[PDB]
Design a protein around this ligand. Structure first.
Ligand code: NAG
Lengths: 86, 48, 40, 20, 36
């Protein structure tokens, strides 16, 4: 749990962070879906618990620089990423 | 001067009331927000 | 029920399914609370 | 008050405090 | 073993309104606060 891993819940391919969830599934319901109709919460087949299944951190790397005619130092910005995730 | 000042004050109070009561006064900004949201939602839904 | 044979108060209904599209509304817990028949 | 993946939303350069 | 039953009272079938009954969960996928 809490690690970017490849998860398999009865042939369910995917990759993401498996975190405990507070949602309340119905007994027959196996895996949930979000507004986008994508896999969001999955119930473990062996032990019955509700787990969120977010995807791993992604973003966009932007580079801040003065002109090379001035200097070669750059600063890198990771868009939409908490500083503890790099 | 006093009449004009009183008229201005009353008008500005009525402006606040009219903005507070009528819901469709700010339709343009809400349309902007809704258009952006629905475009993103449609593009996401196209994945399925 | 044998007293010959006797039947108590009972009634049942038989309806046949058809292919049509519904709009299902799931609540916060995930329970269907309402539906709309798109061809009614 | 009256106004309410692979896709990212970028923040505006001018915060609402600066506009105010 | 089986016994013929002839004490039946003949009657044409009746009819009634279904209203909004007969809706079932189409699949096992969980969904919350959505309209699908
Ligand atoms: C689940 O349903 C109960 C009613 O039985 C409701 O009080 C509760 O708020 C629902 N769960 C959530 C997360 O809203």
């Amino acid at each position: 749990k809490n690690k970017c891993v490849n998860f398999n819940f009865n042939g369910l391919k995917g990759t993401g962070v498996l975190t405990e969830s507070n949602k309340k599934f119905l007994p027959f319901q196996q895996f949930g879906r979000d507004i986008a109709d994508t896999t969001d919460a999955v119930r473990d087949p062996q032990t019955l618990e509700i787990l969120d299944i977010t995807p791993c951190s992604f973003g966009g790397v932007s580079v801040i620089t003065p002109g090379t005619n001035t200097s070669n130092q750059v600063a890198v910005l990771y868009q939409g990423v908490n500083c503890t995730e790099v | 001067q006093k009449l004009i000042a009183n008229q201005f004050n009353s008008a500005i109070g009525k402006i606040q009331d009219s903005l507070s009561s009528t819901p469709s006064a700010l339709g343009k900004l809400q349309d902007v927000v809704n258009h952006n949201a629905q475009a993103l939602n449609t593009l996401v839904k196209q994945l399925s | 029920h044998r007293s010959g044979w006797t039947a108590g108060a009972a009634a049942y209904y038989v309806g046949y399914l058809q292919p049509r599209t519904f709009l299902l509304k799931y609540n916060e817990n995930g329970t269907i609370t309402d539906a709309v028949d798109c061809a009614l | 008050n009256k106004v309410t993946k692979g896709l990212t939303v970028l923040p505006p350069l001018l915060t609402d405090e600066m506009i105010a | 073993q089986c016994v013929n039953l002839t004490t039946r009272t003949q009657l044409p079938p009746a009819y009634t309104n279904s209203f909004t009954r007969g809706v079932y969960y189409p699949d096992k996928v969980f969904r919350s606060s959505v309209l699908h």
